[PDB]
Design an enzyme around this catalytic site. Structure first.
Site, mmCIF file in Angstrom:
data_model
loop_
_atom_site.group_PDB
_atom_site.id
_atom_site.type_symbol
_atom_site.label_atom_id
_atom_site.label_comp_id
_atom_site.label_asym_id
_atom_site.label_seq_id
_atom_site.Cartn_x
_atom_site.Cartn_y
_atom_site.Cartn_z
ATOM 1 N N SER A 20 44.590 24.499 38.822
ATOM 2 C CA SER A 20 45.824 24.766 39.554
ATOM 3 C C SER A 20 45.744 26.091 40.309
ATOM 4 O O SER A 20 45.047 27.021 39.889
ATOM 5 C CB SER A 20 47.020 24.784 38.590
ATOM 6 O OG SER A 20 48.237 25.065 39.259
ATOM 7 N N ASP A 68 46.729 38.704 45.981
ATOM 8 C CA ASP A 68 46.581 38.215 44.605
ATOM 9 C C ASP A 68 45.113 38.174 44.195
ATOM 10 O O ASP A 68 44.547 37.118 43.913
ATOM 11 C CB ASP A 68 47.249 36.843 44.434
ATOM 12 C CG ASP A 68 47.443 36.456 42.970
ATOM 13 O OD1 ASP A 68 47.682 37.350 42.126
ATOM 14 O OD2 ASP A 68 47.355 35.249 42.669
ATOM 15 N N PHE A 119 50.022 27.022 45.427
ATOM 16 C CA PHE A 119 50.850 25.934 45.947
ATOM 17 C C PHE A 119 50.753 24.622 45.189
ATOM 18 O O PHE A 119 50.987 23.555 45.762
ATOM 19 C CB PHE A 119 50.528 25.675 47.419
ATOM 20 C CG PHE A 119 50.784 26.845 48.305
ATOM 21 C CD1 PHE A 119 51.595 27.893 47.880
ATOM 22 C CD2 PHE A 119 50.203 26.909 49.561
ATOM 23 C CE1 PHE A 119 51.819 28.988 48.694
ATOM 24 C CE2 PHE A 119 50.417 27.997 50.387
ATOM 25 C CZ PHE A 119 51.226 29.041 49.957
ATOM 26 N N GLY A 120 50.394 24.680 43.915
ATOM 27 C CA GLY A 120 50.306 23.447 43.168
ATOM 28 C C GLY A 120 49.009 23.236 42.429
ATOM 29 O O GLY A 120 48.335 24.186 42.035
ATOM 30 N N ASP A 121 48.657 21.970 42.256
ATOM 31 C CA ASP A 121 47.459 21.599 41.529
ATOM 32 C C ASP A 121 46.266 21.297 42.428
ATOM 33 O O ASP A 121 46.405 20.935 43.612
ATOM 34 C CB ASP A 121 47.749 20.397 40.629
ATOM 35 C CG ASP A 121 49.130 20.455 40.004
ATOM 36 O OD1 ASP A 121 49.282 21.088 38.937
ATOM 37 O OD2 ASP A 121 50.066 19.867 40.588
ATOM 38 N N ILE A 122 45.089 21.450 41.835
ATOM 39 C CA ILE A 122 43.834 21.223 42.511
ATOM 40 C C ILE A 122 43.147 20.098 41.771
ATOM 41 O O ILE A 122 42.937 20.184 40.564
ATOM 42 C CB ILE A 122 42.981 22.487 42.476
ATOM 43 C CG1 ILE A 122 43.810 23.657 43.018
ATOM 44 C CG2 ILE A 122 41.715 22.297 43.317
ATOM 45 C CD1 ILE A 122 43.243 25.022 42.706
ATOM 46 N N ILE A 132 41.190 19.271 38.052
ATOM 47 C CA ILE A 132 40.276 20.335 37.682
ATOM 48 C C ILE A 132 40.912 21.719 37.559
ATOM 49 O O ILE A 132 40.288 22.642 37.038
ATOM 50 C CB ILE A 132 39.088 20.386 38.663
ATOM 51 C CG1 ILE A 132 39.572 20.638 40.094
ATOM 52 C CG2 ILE A 132 38.316 19.074 38.608
ATOM 53 C CD1 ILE A 132 38.440 20.670 41.115
#
Lengths: 296, 293
Positions: A17, A128, A20-23, A15
């Site tokens: 990113s 951020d 720390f990476g992808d979601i 779904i």
């Protein structure tokens, strides 16, 4: 066969990113709850995910902070399972054809400043701040803005003595150059004030459709951020906020004036917008642009 | 053949003289970047370079501190290469027909007070604060005021015990007499208060364009100093700052009253100007006088 992380978490579609990476979308089969699984490649180089979880757990309980379901490991991945929320403010922005009305901006600003205020009370700076790192809740919580992604976050003062980090130059990870504060661009360490400044930009982005330093399209060389930095410092607040209620320019200016260690007057900031809200004669219902879109 | 220092940097035009050496333009042949080279003859009776390079290193990481690139010993010289920065606040003053507007002066005053504050947190006093020792960065950092030249820098307290140095007098004037504090003129040992007093004269120099003791005719240097000291001591701050926002007078007054070992309140000193920046309705843009030319 089907892919299931942990035991109970049925893995699903990618779904999105984050830092720390992808979601990935997942499902807690043993509970029938759709959740969000984030998984970082065990040994990348800087396994920062075990750190983010720590922060989420320190913030656990706060208003508008996603609940963590599980943290652990599964093969070449360390997985963090957290509460699946609604769309991000970026999604909703596009959904509304990239057009937020003043009331919605004001209605949103009030909550965004509160999430930011909360992270700070817990000794951290988010670092951020962008429309993507804020999500709307689901169902009953549908009118609550959530703050996510503590990947670039940092402790800005000792949790016991409360001694503020010293004023030095940055030797860390930076966020989106588009919403970055001037200091970030000058190479200075970020602190409370910088989180609030980027918000000033997020708010102006919502009012403007896009920022003036947005999409400069530079050359192949390493730094495009050099152009952004320039366009950004060359564009005065009075020009940026041209055609909008002064409360916005007064917001940015105030943040720029703050010293590295000053505790921000959050209420003052909420005060500016609320006074404007009440002035324009707005009802404090949680009826946002995206709610009206169904009627045209 | 071509003059090459340490087989890494080609030497260029001598762009000035530091406290105890000469600054030459240089080029990191490999990276092509422009650097600043400081040279000290190995046969000096008072070697400071090895001391100065050490200080810059302690200061590393601070906002507005130049980076040392390399240190080497050539045949006849000791070398200290450091990053080259932009023009100094004197070159920009002169570029701007020797006139700085209130906000440009206030925007700089804030950064300048931060640097001195920083150095003091490191247990050193600059002892030669003047516009020449302040340089703007390059590119995006071109809005950042840098402090340079720690040749006259002195440690004012033990690195561990923090026991401040003893009070001594009968000392000699150290630094530019034009900005030298009244205490310096009285041969009194320097401490934190002096770095800030001199910054005071630097601010008024930017406001006024010239200082009341600048331009006195004299032949002998000690005679020069005697005259300068006289005019300085004989010029009331109230008169000096005539017509300018009281804040400046308030600043110098505060500075001229701190006890020898007093820890300056840099926040109050900054709060004055930030309050003045505010009352003047000045907005926070990084556009300076020189940018309107």
């Amino acid at each position: 066969m089907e892919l299931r992380v942990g035991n109970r978490y049925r893995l699903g579609r990618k779904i999105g990113s984050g830092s720390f990476g992808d979601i990935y979308l997942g499902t807690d089969i043993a509970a029938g709850e759709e959740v969000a699984i984030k998984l970082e490649c065990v040994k990348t180089k800087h396994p920062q995910l075990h750190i983010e979880s720590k922060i989420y757990k320190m913030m656990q309980g706060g208003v508008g902070i996603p609940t963590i379901r599980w943290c652990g490991a599964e093969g070449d991945y360390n997985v963090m399972v957290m509460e699946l929320l609604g769309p991000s403010l970026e999604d909703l922005f596009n959904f509304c054809s990239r057009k937020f009305s003043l009331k919605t901006v004001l209605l949103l600003a009030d909550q965004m400043i509160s999430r930011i205020e909360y992270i700070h009370s817990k000794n951290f700076i988010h670092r951020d701040v962008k429309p993507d790192n804020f999500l709307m809740g689901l169902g009953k919580k549908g009118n609550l803005v959530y703050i996510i992604d503590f990947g670039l976050a940092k402790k800005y003062r000792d949790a016991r003595t409360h001694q503020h980090i010293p004023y030095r130059e940055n030797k860390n990870l930076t966020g989106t150059a588009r919403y970055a504060s001037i200091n970030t661009h000058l190479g200075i360490e970020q602190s409370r004030r910088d989180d609030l400044e980027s918000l000033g930009y997020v708010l102006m982005y919502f009012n403007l459709g896009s920022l003036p330093w947005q999409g400069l399209k530079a050359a192949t060389k390493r730094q495009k951020y050099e152009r952004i930095s320039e366009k950004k410092m060359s564009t005065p607040i009075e020009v940026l906020c041209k055609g909008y209620p002064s409360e916005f320019a007064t917001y940015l200016n105030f943040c720029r004036s703050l010293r590295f260690d000053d505790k921000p007057d959050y209420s003052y900031l909420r005060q500016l917008f609320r006074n404007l809200f009440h002035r324009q004669g707005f009802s404090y219902d949680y009826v946002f642009d995206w709610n009206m879109l169904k009627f045209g």
